[PDB]
Design a protein around this ligand. Structure first.
Ligand SMILES: C=C[C@H]1CN2CC[C@H]1C[C@@H]2[C@@H](O)c1ccnc2ccc(OC)cc12
Ligand SMILES: *[C@@H]1O[C@H](CO)[C@@H](O)[C@H](O)[C@H]1NC(C)=O
Ligand SMILES: *[C@@H]1O[C@H](CO)[C@@H](O)[C@H](O)[C@H]1NC(C)=O
Ligand SMILES: *[C@@H]1O[C@H](CO)[C@@H](O)[C@H](O)[C@H]1NC(C)=O
Ligand SMILES: *[C@@H]1O[C@H](CO)[C@@H](O)[C@H](O)[C@H]1NC(C)=O
Ligand SMILES: *[C@@H]1O[C@H](CO)[C@@H](O)[C@H](O)[C@H]1NC(C)=O
Ligand SMILES: *[C@@H]1O[C@H](CO)[C@@H](O)[C@H](O)[C@H]1NC(C)=O
Ligand SMILES: *[C@@H]1O[C@H](CO)[C@@H](O)[C@H](O)[C@H]1NC(C)=O
Ligand SMILES: *[C@@H]1O[C@H](CO)[C@@H](O)[C@H](O)[C@H]1NC(C)=O
Ligand SMILES: *[C@@H]1O[C@H](CO)[C@@H](O)[C@H](O)[C@H]1NC(C)=O
Length: 1151
């Protein structure tokens, strides 16, 4: 009949191309927010084509009882759902919320079954998510335990406002409050935002606390616990639903600097030990354990797929011969390859305000280089036939560069897109032939756009699907809700398609929570919670699996003098000598932590460090002099540790001689005695473990220099492009009293209008501090944009662009967002990819050079691993319990059952649930019942404890979990009984808490029985020594930068990032700033006051107690400080990853 004819229609490639064109056109139509009534045509034609497509399918593959074909296929259920949805929506609507249309988008998802083997990529992603399966349950377990720690420590401990003083006024029945105006009731007084403190600069609310460590109220306001909440209401640490969210954003490190720059301000500064626990065990470990299992899963399935796949004539001749002979000269190769270096150095010289004849010489330069390159093209075309010249990797690229640089330049009188200057700028890639590392960065991009080119297309589909789902759902809600006062939407709304795309792009970048707040403020918590977690899990799974795909695809491809020498060698061999030396180095290093801004008033102890310093110098000088003739110059100067000690002793001696003898305080002697912060590095050679760590990092130095040169020469492209696009355009005229807001563009148009109207000295024309003016200044902007910290003020200054030197305007240059999108996709992403891919290979071949293959490992810890691996490998043979008596002999008949063990195991989860239900400011009804059932559970567990003790005499204390069980029992006993002694004591908002935390020791009995948690947690218990060893070096580097910063960065102005409690004024306050920068979190705000100068934003000639004047930090050391601390921290934090993945692979491939 025609069924054989419908099968003939179904198998066309033209039919699949037609369905592709229809799906893509409907994708273009569904991504408009405001459809006009011309959609009577197109929507009916789409639902006609989608009718015709499904009819062709069901005529071939139907009849009635199809459980075998067309409906056991899962991708056709969506196609059937779409057409039945269109047919059930085109008669009559039932609920007119008009959110019905979104399911229509499921049209855009149908193209996964239509294009190619994209149907296999989604199956592989589902295989990897299925493969995780234990990391997820331990993630929710550790987030549960740490959330309960955060409750029993921090309950209600984050609502603290710094309210104004009041009085009960003794004149009414009730609670009248006096603020200089009458106020009714205490409760209504504490609820009005007329009594609170705005922080300086911002518009947050100030937080305080009764503790001695915490933030302090000013001279007239009171620190007490009464208000709404912080951020918008979504950041309190009570109410375990919110504690799980707060510790989850803690785990993915989104804006957590703001979480604990609000926690430590209220709870006291001693609680950064909790954040040092969760950042170094929750975030850095659980995040770096997801990646290991995903990478091992990908490598396993890729290995399986590879394994399964494996199973006229005279003039022409004379002129041609000579030119050809010239062309293959390896010396003429050199004078062009080293000539493009001159061009890219000549274009990286075009700065911000050229001096009107400098620009002419630069144009003449570009013209000369263009002539040199075109002459080369002509000589190589004459050199050999143009069909032979247009062959292979490198001549058509050079032809395209010449014909683009030539044609646009020939359009001499031009409108100018500014791109044309760029057209020449693309030529930097030409030296990838010689350079063996830009070859690999070209291979990564070519591997992403066409050997892994479908997996980026799945990502382009998924980003588009979420940007349409969000635009259809959340789009109308933003409209009148947004504040205006002009007609003015926010920066990160979702009404358009483009803003809807950027807000998904941010969640891919890792910044998701300030959009959840702006979304929950209009759309309710339920939808907005769901969408922005699905985007985060699905999108980061896709982006991460793409990242690992690229990385794997890349790196997959006088005879008493002799006795006098020996007796002096005998004293440095004598162990008490270096035992004295270690304690002397530690004391000499820690003693200079007292150098702070309180050493002027601490006048007494100030001299005690002078004597100490001038004693330590003499001891170390005697040390070097005593080691000299004990070892000889040959053994001493060829050790490369003794050069470090010799350099430090030399610095101390120069400082000493200049200080004592020459009255040498004259000039840069102060800048030389700043350099005595390097004294901790004497310990770097003596603790054997940090010697092992610095050997492992010194060995992998030369690769880092290569990849950093590649990243420098590759960001040079975008820096010259950013100078070409945005030089001078970041110039803002500012009303001074309001501080930090750009002026209206309708009353001040140009800089002429700004500097023309200071009849009063108010208006200041300031640059954004991180501008693109120089090529060197543009590199720091690229560093802030690439590290995902600080880019807001860069993008908002770029998008606001309007001219050359004239006021910015709210969205006058909107589409410049795609420039930073291109930079984050190319620069950050592929840079990081190449960077991790280089380091992994370097550490792998460094392991492939040694003996004992464990790196980051001292010898004694290598002896420890061999005994620690004997503990739990391969399941031990076990003895079986036997009765002894008739009395207790029938008890273990009830106890040793498998039903009793799971009875305890699901009874203790109920004991967890009764811990989860706690709240702040509950009711007195609840504490009584909850405290009664508190003792009830303890009674049950103590009962079964004593039963199992008396049931087995020596067989109790064997399993080493059962010891832990009795320990948790006696901890629960003390935690219940002590509670009654608190009343006759000192202040206890927090002493009872640290006693109450011992009930969480019950929760750690759930891991007895979960093999997916015991295995993967013993993988860290086996990984503690290398983690400890890297940690020493991390603390040491933290210590050295703390002293340099405390020497340099004290007495800066306080603003964006440097408040009264996170500053470089003492050692305790400096450790906290460097701890938040150790995770790269928020270093943008510390640098922003350091880059100041004369007015505004700072003030020189400031009265200063330390004998140093000024209040303005210096940008030269301020940039250097942060920009080398980030890289050093990154490296180490990249070591940690290598140690974790080594111990994971060893346990996994072991059993
Ligand atoms: C959970 C950790 C992942 C998140 N970032 C990318 C991969 C890892 C590590 C890194 C981050 O932890 C990090 C640590 C230390 N220094 C960094 C410096 C820059 C950076 O770019 C966002 C991330 C850094
Ligand atoms: C309240 O006012 C009365 C006088 O009207 C005075 O005697 C009393 O001491 C006051 N009490 C307080 C607590 O102010
Ligand atoms: C307050 O005092 C007045 C007397 O003027 C009385 O009528 C009223 O009941 C009192 N308030 C309360 C809550 O009892
Ligand atoms: C505000 O109350 C506090 C009590 O903590 C007190 O120390 C302070 O002196 C009061 N301020 C004024 C202006 O009375
Ligand atoms: C601090 O203590 C005072 C009295 O000891 C109390 O009235 C106040 O509410 C407390 N504030 C906080 C934040 O605990
Ligand atoms: C700067 O701000 C102050 C206070 O808002 C205002 O009075 C002044 O007019 C502003 N300057 C100019 C030039 O308008
Ligand atoms: C600046 O803009 C104003 C328009 O308000 C115009 O009159 C003036 O000529 C411009 N000056 C410069 C230097 O661009
Ligand atoms: C405005 O004029 C005052 C004159 O006192 C000057 O201090 C300030 O630098 C000027 N600002 C600009 C942008 O011209
Ligand atoms: C600047 O002022 C005008 C007043 O005519 C206002 O309409 C405009 O919205 C303001 N600019 C911005 C970016 O709000
Ligand atoms: C906040 O501003 C006030 C007044 O401008 C100042 O006295 C104080 O030192 C500032 N800094 C704080 C509270 O950290």
């Amino acid at each position: 009949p025609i069924r054989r004819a419908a099968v003939k229609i179904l198998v066309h490639s033209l039919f699949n191309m037609l369905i592709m064109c229809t799906i893509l056109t409907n994708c273009v139509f569904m991504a408009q927010h405001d459809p006009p009534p011309w959609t009577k045509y197109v929507e009916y034609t789409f639902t006609a084509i989608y009718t015709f497509e499904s009819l062709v399918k069901i005529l071939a593959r139907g009849f009635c009882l199809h459980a075998f074909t067309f409906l056991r296929d899962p991708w056709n259920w969506l196609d059937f759902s779409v057409i039945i949805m269109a047919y059930t929506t085109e008669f009559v609507d039932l609920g007119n919320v008009s959110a019905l249309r979104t399911f229509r988008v499921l049209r855009a998802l149908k193209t996964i079954s239509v294009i190619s083997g994209l149907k296999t990529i989604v199956g592989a992603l589902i295989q990897s998510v299925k493969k995780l399966a234990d990391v997820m349950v331990l993630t929710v377990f550790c987030l549960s335990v740490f959330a309960l720690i955060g409750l029993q420590l921090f309950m209600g401990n984050l609502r603290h406002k710094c309210v104004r003083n009041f009085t009960a006024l003794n004149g009414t029945n009730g609670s009248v409050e006096a603020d200089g105006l009458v106020w009714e009731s205490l409760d209504l007084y504490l609820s009005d935002p007329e009594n609170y403190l705005l922080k300086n600069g911002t518009s947050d609310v100030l937080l305080c606390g009764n503790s001695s460590d915490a933030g302090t109220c000013p001279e007239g306001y009171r620190c007490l616990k009464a208000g709404e909440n912080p951020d918008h209401g979504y950041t309190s640490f009570d109410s375990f639903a919110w504690a799980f969210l707060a510790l989850f954003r803690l785990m993915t490190q989104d804006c957590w600097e703001r979480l604990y720059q609000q926690t430590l301000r209220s709870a006291g500064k001693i609680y950064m030990i909790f954040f040092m626990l969760v950042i170094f065990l929750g975030s850095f470990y659980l995040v770096n354990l997801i990646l290991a299992v995903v990478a091992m899963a990908y490598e396993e399935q890729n290995q399986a797929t590879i394994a399964e796949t494996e199973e006229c004539c005279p003039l022409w001749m004379s002129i041609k011969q000579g030119v050809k002979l010239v062309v293959m000269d390896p010396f003429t190769d050199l004078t062009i390859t080293m000539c493009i270096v001159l061009n890219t150095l000549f274009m990286a010289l075009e700065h911000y305000n050229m001096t009107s004849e400098f620009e002419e010489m630069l144009q003449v330069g570009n013209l000369v280089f263009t002539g040199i390159f075109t002459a080369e093209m002509t000589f190589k075309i004459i050199a050999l036939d143009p069909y032979y010249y247009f062959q292979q990797g490198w001549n058509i690229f050079d032809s395209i560069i010449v014909i683009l640089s030539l044609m646009e330049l020939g359009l001499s009188r031009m409108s100018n897109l500014s791109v044309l200057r760029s057209f020449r700028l693309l030529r930097v890639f030409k030296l990838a032939k010689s350079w063996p590392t830009l070859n690999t960065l070209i291979k990564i991009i070519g591997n992403s756009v066409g050997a892994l080119g479908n997996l980026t297309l799945v990502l382009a589909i998924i980003v588009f699907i979420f940007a349409v789902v969000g635009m259809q759902l959340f789009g109308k809600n933003y409209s009148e809700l947004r504040d205006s006062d002009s007609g003015l939407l926010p920066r990160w709304h979702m009404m358009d398609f483009f803003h809807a795309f950027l807000i998904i792009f941010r969640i891919l970048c890792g910044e998701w929570i300030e959009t959840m707040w702006d979304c929950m403020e209009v759309s309710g918590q339920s939808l907005c919670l769901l969408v922005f977690l699905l985007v985060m899990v699905i999108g980061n799974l896709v982006v991460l699996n793409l990242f690992l795909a690229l990385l794997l695809s890349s790196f997959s491809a006088g005879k008493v003098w002799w006795r006098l020498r020996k007796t002096c060698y005998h004293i440095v061999e004598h162990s008490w000598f270096e035992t004295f030396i270690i304690f002397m180095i530690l004391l000499s290093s820690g003693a200079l932590a007292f150098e702070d801004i309180y050493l002027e008033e601490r006048k007494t102890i100030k001299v005690l460090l002078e004597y100490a310093d001038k004693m330590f110098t003499y001891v170390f000088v005697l040390e070097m002099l005593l080691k000299w003739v004990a070892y000889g110059f040959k053994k001493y100067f060829t050790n490369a540790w003794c050069w470090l000690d010799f350099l430090i002793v030399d610095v101390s001696l120069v400082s000493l001689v200049a200080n004592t003898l020459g009255f040498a305080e004259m000039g840069p002697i102060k800048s030389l005695r700043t350099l005595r912060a390097l004294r901790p590095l004497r310990a770097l050679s003596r603790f054997e473990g940090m010697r092992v760590v610095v050997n492992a990092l010194v060995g992998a130095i030369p690769s880092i220099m290569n990849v950093l040169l590649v990243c420098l020469i590759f960001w040079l492209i975008f820096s010259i492009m950013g100078v070409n696009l945005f030089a001078g355009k970041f110039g803002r005229c500012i009303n001074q009293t309001e501080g930090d807001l750009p002026l209206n563009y309708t009353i001040v148009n140009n800089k002429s209008q700004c500097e023309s109207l200071n009849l009063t000295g108010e208006l200041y024309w300031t640059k954004v501090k991180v501008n693109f003016d120089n090529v060197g200044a543009g590199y720091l902007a690229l560093l802030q944009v690439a590290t995902f910290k600080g880019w807001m003020d860069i993008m908002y200054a770029a998008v606001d662009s309007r001219g050359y030197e004239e006021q910015p305007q709210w969205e006058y240059n909107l589409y410049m967002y795609i420039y930073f999108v291109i930079f984050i996709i190319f620069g950050s992403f592929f840079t990081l990819n190449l960077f991790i891919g280089v380091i992994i290979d370097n550490f792998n071949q460094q392991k492939k050079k040694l003996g004992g293959q464990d790196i980051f490992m001292t010898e004694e810890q290598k002896k420890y691993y061999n005994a620690m691996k004997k503990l739990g490998s391969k399941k031990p043979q076990k003895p079986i319990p036997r009765p002894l008596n008739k009395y207790q002999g029938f008890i273990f008949d009830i106890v040793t059952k498998q039903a009793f063990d799971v009875t305890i195991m699901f009874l203790i989860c109920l004991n967890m649930v009764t811990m989860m239900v706690e709240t702040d400011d509950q009711s007195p009804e609840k504490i009584n019942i909850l405290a009664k059932i508190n003792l009830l559970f303890v009674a049950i567990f103590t009962g079964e404890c004593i039963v199992k003790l008396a049931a087995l005499r020596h067989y109790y204390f064997t399993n080493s979990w059962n010891i832990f069980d009795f320990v948790v029992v006696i901890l629960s006993i003390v935690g219940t009984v002590l509670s009654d002694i608190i009343q006759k004591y000192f202040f206890s908002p927090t002493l009872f808490r640290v006693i109450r935390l011992a009930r969480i020791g019950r929760i750690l009995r759930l891991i007895r029985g979960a093999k997916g948690i015991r295995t993967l947690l013993f993988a860290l218990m086996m990984s503690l020594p290398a983690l400890f060893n890297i940690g020493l070096l991390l603390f040491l580097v933290m210590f050295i930068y703390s002293i340099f910063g405390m020497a340099n960065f004290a007495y800066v102005k306080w603003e964006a990032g440097i408040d009264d409690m996170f500053n470089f004024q003492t050692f305790a306050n400096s450790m906290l700033c460097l701890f938040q920068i150790t995770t790269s979190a928020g270093w943008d705000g510390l640098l922003s006051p350091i880059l100041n100068t004369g007015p505004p934003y700072c003030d020189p000639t400031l009265p200063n107690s330390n004998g140093s004047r000024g209040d303005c930090g210096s940008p030269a050391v301020g940039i250097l400080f942060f920009t080398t601390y980030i890289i050093i921290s990154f490296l180490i934090v990249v070591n940690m990853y290598i140690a974790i993945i080594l111990e994971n692979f060893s346990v996994a491939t072991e059993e």
